[PDB]
Amino acid sequence: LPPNAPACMERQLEAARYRSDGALLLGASSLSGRCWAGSLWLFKDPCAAPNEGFCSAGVQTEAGVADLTWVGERGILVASDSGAVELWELDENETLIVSKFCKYEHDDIVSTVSVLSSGTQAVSGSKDICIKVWDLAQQVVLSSYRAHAAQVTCVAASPHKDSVFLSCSEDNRILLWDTRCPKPASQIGCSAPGYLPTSLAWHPQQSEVFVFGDENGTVSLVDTKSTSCVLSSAVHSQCVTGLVFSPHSVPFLASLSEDCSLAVLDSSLSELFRSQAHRDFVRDATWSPLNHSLLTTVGWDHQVVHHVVP
Amino acid sequence: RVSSGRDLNCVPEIADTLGAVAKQGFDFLCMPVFHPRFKREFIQEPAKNRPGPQTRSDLLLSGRDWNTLIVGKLSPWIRPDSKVEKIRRNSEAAMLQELNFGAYLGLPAFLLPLNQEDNTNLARVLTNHIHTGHHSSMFWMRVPLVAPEDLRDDIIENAPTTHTEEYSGEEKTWMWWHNFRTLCDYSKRIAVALEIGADLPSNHVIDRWLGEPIKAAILPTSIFLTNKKGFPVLSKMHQRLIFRLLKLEVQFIITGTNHHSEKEFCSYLQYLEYLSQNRPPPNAYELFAKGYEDYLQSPLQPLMDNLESQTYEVFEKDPIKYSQYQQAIYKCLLDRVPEEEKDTNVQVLMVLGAGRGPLVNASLRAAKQADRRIKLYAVEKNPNAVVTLENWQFEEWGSQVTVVSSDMREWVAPEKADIIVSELLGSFADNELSPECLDGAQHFLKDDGVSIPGEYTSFLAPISSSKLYNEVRACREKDRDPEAQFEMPYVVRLHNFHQLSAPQPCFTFSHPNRDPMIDNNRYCTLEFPVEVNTVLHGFAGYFETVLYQDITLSIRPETHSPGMFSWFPILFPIKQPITVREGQTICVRFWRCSNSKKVWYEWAVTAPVCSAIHNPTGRSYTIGL
Numbered sequence A: 001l002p003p004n005a006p007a008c009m010e011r012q013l014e015a016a017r018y019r020s021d022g023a024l025l026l027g028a029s030s031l032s033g034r035c036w037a038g039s040l041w042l043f044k045d046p047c048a049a050p051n052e053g054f055c056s057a058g059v060q061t062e063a064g065v066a067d068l069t070w071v072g073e074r075g076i077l078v079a080s081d082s083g084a085v086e087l088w089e090l091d092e093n094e095t096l097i098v099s100k101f102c103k104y105e106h107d108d109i110v111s112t113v114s115v116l117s118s119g120t121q122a123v124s125g126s127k128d129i130c131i132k133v134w135d136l137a138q139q140v141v142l143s144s145y146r147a148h149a150a151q152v153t154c155v156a157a158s159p160h161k162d163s164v165f166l167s168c169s170e171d172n173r174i175l176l177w178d179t180r181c182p183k184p185a186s187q188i189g190c191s192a193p194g195y196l197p198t199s200l201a202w203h204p205q206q207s208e209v210f211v212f213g214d215e216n217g218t219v220s221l222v223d224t225k226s227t228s229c230v231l232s233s234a235v236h237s238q239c240v241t242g243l244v245f246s247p248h249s250v251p252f253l254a255s256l257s258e259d260c261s262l263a264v265l266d267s268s269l270s271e272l273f274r275s276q277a278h279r280d281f282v283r284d285a286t287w288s289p290l291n292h293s294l295l296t297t298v299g300w301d302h303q304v305v306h307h308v309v310p
Numbered sequence B: 001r002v003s004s005g006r007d008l009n010c011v012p013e014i015a016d017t018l019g020a021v022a023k024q025g026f027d028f029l030c031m032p033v034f035h036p037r038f039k040r041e042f043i044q045e046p047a048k049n050r051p052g053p054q055t056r057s058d059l060l061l062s063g064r065d066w067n068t069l070i071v072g073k074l075s076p077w078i079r080p081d082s083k084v085e086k087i088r089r090n091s092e093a094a095m096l097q098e099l100n101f102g103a104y105l106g107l108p109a110f111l112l113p114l115n116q117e118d119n120t121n122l123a124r125v126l127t128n129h130i131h132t133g134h135h136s137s138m139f140w141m142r143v144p145l146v147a148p149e150d151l152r153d154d155i156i157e158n159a160p161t162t163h164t165e166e167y168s169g170e171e172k173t174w175m176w177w178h179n180f181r182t183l184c185d186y187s188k189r190i191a192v193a194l195e196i197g198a199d200l201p202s203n204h205v206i207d208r209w210l211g212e213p214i215k216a217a218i219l220p221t222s223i224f225l226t227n228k229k230g231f232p233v234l235s236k237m238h239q240r241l242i243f244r245l246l247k248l249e250v251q252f253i254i255t256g257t258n259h260h261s262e263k264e265f266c267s268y269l270q271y272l273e274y275l276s277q278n279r280p281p282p283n284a285y286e287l288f289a290k291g292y293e294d295y296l297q298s299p300l301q302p303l304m305d306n307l308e309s310q311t312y313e314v315f316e317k318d319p320i321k322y323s324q325y326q327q328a329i330y331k332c333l334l335d336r337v338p339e340e341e342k343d344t345n346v347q348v349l350m351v352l353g354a355g356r357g358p359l360v361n362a363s364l365r366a367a368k369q370a371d372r373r374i375k376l377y378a379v380e381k382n383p384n385a386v387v388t389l390e391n392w393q394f395e396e397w398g399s400q401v402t403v404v405s406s407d408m409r410e411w412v413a414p415e416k417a418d419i420i421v422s423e424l425l426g427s428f429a430d431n432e433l434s435p436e437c438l439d440g441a442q443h444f445l446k447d448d449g450v451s452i453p454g455e456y457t458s459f460l461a462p463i464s465s466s467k468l469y470n471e472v473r474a475c476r477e478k479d480r481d482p483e484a485q486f487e488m489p490y491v492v493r494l495h496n497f498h499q500l501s502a503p504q505p506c507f508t509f510s511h512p513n514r515d516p517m518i519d520n521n522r523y524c525t526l527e528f529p530v531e532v533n534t535v536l537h538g539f540a541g542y543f544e545t546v547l548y549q550d551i552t553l554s555i556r557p558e559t560h561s562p563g564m565f566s567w568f569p570i571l572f573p574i575k576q577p578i579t580v581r582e583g584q585t586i587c588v589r590f591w592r593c594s595n596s597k598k599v600w601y602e603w604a605v606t607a608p609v610c611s612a613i614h615n616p617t618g619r620s621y622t623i624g625l
């Protein structure tokens, strides 16, 4: 095991993000037992994960990791149980991981984080019901929005627009944000109120298209333009925790649920692949940049699974 | 001074966290008993077979710490009222699990949110836990003054905040509380943790909470301002509310992160202690009345019963009250004897119910003050108190005072009286039967004789107090009617309550009573205009008496005799609380009823809804003749 790297990883795997070069970012929390904390791990050999002694780099966080995002190639931005957003910096040699900043702005657990298209700004969401806009360079809150009336489940920055991001809350609202507007939020979704929205993913190519998942296992395709719900499929028997698009020219949609299953869907939202591999909740998915047929899932069963997608 | 706790939703190590919050000066910690993000599956394989442990060990603290220093919190993913069946089922199971663990741990309290309107299934599950073994632990329902939907920034272009004001709408969080506690049948274990926001609502919205069982106030760091030296502080309005809450002796809870970074959370806490020690100090009455707040006591019946030595002692411990008596007699003597007849004229002064003699002494001080001449009879049916009197007259009064061991209704007086003096008044004035007693004695008063007191009047006012409704209700006893508790008055230092309308006179008596035919029976109809939404639980009673001319005693708040702690108010409960809407009138009816044997009160509310007549034929409560 490397220096500054913990000789043991917490059981609950929260996040998995393949960088450009195919290196693996792992977030984990301790959700039970004496010590409720979290860890950040780097696996330049992804097939070695989750074993700690084969890791490139690892560090201990004060608290659990609710959410994670790569900031460029050396940056890790952390949503903490502590109500802190944490910026973690990679080593020159990438042997260790060191705290750039840890800011206690959220009055409750930080649930969700997304980096805006600049790489100089990020959006956080919390159980404190607020959404905050972060200046990563100056390590400060530019804006705090109480648009929602219950805990914020997800925030996803637009691929190419630094002022645009989606949010969803247990208040049953999906908000489309544009900080350039004086009233920056706009309530979007299906014409009919339905089940609580749980997960968000923009289309990587079509900047006005996104999918959301719900508490009832339904995945839905939305056009900002049509302001009407395009297509919906009942993919899961439990809430949709995550929605991830393939790096392919015509993307694939990876669906992850508390039903402990992975589903891979076409553009028409039809079902291509399904994995009962995990025997607890499936928390994240990343497609290899190297081989786009490879999909890596992590779960609370502490399984790092590598899928071969047709 | 102030009892406060820390609210946290992140506890990496319970030992370290607890030490921290103690170091900062917190009496207790509100924390999760399971990891807030650790959602559990109970029905579906494979997640249901998730290997444990399901949380951290009870061995990590002493039983004493668990019992005194910890308040548990329901996990936030638990939604028993979810419209998704599976989430409902899982939340039912997790809620029981977390509550059962709290009971396992011996936690003194457990926090549950009212964060929306429909908490029906949440209530059903809590009621089930409560009805699973008799336990003492409290449930703190975390309710905001202002619902989060009505707090949100107006930053949604196509969903503007309704800026148009709604009276009842702004009271929606009270209705959340009311429905929850009504479903749970006013369990004494279920109380309010009132969460305060940066934007305090209208006064009516705050007044909604007046008589409610508030155990805690939650103060987010967010609502605190910054002074010149950058210290956390509060708006004067926030401060007026804190001063209000200190009177209810609630526990304060600080929630959220330290927004005053170049300081520590002792800053927030020190501000509270600062306010507490800097609170407007309480009057001597409030110091007298310090232990008795909302304490239910039986009205004394000094006719039917022989009061104890220490009862007379407390009666005597009101120097203001006897100064008034001295002054009334002082004035009456000068009125009755001109200075020309000063030495030739000796007035026959009779004290009727003289107890241990304080009115005898006041009568004597009055006569020397007036420099006029008096002959004193001290009439007292309580032979134990006659012991005190006869020792006083042998040792001190001498033959000026004739002690009479007799009922004033039976006594054959050797002569007629110039002045009769009496302290036969309870908290509803005539509730100890001053009228019947004085009526019996009035044959031996001179045709021009004065009774001190000459007059007394009872007053009533409708009140709201879910606290006192519950305390009455808790007074069920074996071997009697299960609702008799509600058909009797209590003497009580009314504290946690809302007076719904100005007091109105109920019953009036005059002495002597020159009526050719005298009937002490009464029937009275009162209309209390109500300007708030509320729930009626009963009627506060008070009284005023005219000792002589302008000399009075009153426990009626508007005219309260200053510094006179001798009588707390009386309370007439009703069996079923009655909802009253702003604008509506409360119509109550009171009867004073009698036999040769007993006198009693009956009462009914007739508007906005009818109650049952309470205490028909004195079946639950009588006053012995």
Ligand SMILES: CSC[C@H]1O[C@@H](n2cnc3c(N)ncnc32)[C@H](O)[C@@H]1O
Residues within 6 Å of the ligand: B302, B303, B306, B307, B315, B352, B353, B354, B355, B356, B379, B380, B381, B382, B385, B406, B407, B408, B409, B423, B424, B437
């Ligand atoms: C000093 S409190 C009033 C006193 O009046 C006495 N008392 C009440 N009713 C009567 C009565 N009918 N005759 C004589 N004393 C009375 C009581 O025993 C009590 O000490």
